[PDB]
Write a protein that binds this ligand. Sequence first.
Ligand code: FES
Ligand SMILES: [Fe+3]
Length: 397
Amino acid sequence: TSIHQRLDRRLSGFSLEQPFYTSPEVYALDLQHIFYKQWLYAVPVCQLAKAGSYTTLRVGAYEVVIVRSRDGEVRAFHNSCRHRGSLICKARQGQVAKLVCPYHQWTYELDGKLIWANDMGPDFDASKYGLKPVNLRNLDGLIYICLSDTPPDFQTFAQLARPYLEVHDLKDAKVAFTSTIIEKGNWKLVWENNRECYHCSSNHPALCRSFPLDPEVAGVGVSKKLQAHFDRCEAAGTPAQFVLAGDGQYRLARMPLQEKALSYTMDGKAAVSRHLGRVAPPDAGTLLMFHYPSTWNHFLPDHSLTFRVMPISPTETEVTTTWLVHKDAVEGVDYDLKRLTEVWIATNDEDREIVETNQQGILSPAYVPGPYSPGQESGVMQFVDWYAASLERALAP
Ligand code: FES
Ligand SMILES: [Fe+3]
């Protein structure tokens, strides 16, 4: 059986056949044509708010480092020394003058420029052996990167995005806290969990307090109190109106939080005293922002959350949640760290458990596609479709 044959006979209303979540062949194809080629959420730029700052991430097999120059820009490169391929930047995050390879001290400037290589003598050009760039975009506070040499368009997404995102002044955030977890499920199944709300009824006693459960919010023609809600925000000059890429990849909507909620706290109250950005009115709700395959976010009036989805193996996905708060918000005065993060640390573990159980269930050669609820999983069907369509595009000539 071919992938082509499996993709052919895929009907729209169903979960995928086994090999999409279990086989290393699909994994390889997903790496190849989706993670290595599309735009990926990396890091907010508040991690690199000093020159020389750097951060590193692995994408599939690639070792990337994103760093800030003296010249002010954020460039990103392949973390493999051009001499014999050593990592340059080990530590997760940090600060240097130059990029100095710890094997043989070949030193690069912070724009790649190889400016010293030792006893490489007469035949040696250094113009050939600079660090390999990785295309990189700054999206009003979020660094996305792209490992293809010929990236897709970012700018159309960048342009729908800016207005909903400017009001957060994400450039003026600081990381309060960062959580990595690794879920023992396929990266696709992470997305399926997230693009529904449905299980949430009996799987998240915390979030629910604060986050909607009505499938309109995180589901896929606009209800009546919603335009009203979009309206109060836009009258206010906070963009709120639902918008959804025509390819299905990315989406914008500032959604009302569960009756009364102001933030993702136990008490529905602000998490930080010093709000981030200029969101307005107070109760504008939560900005949802997804972007297949790499991120979803919840941008509140008090603080911001990124999530970064990264695949590790056919049945493992690294999910990185980051808390963003104003740079002058003090821990202990302005916010309390526990209180700032208990809701979602709880919610992410509940999902993980859920994803992990699903994964296991799926590994049964007895598993066959069953049907999505059109009432609760229409947003899941939407992911799967963007997914299949992306694999077909990448696979023709
Ligand atoms: S391997 Fe990097 S300088 Fe030798
Ligand atoms: Fe969930």
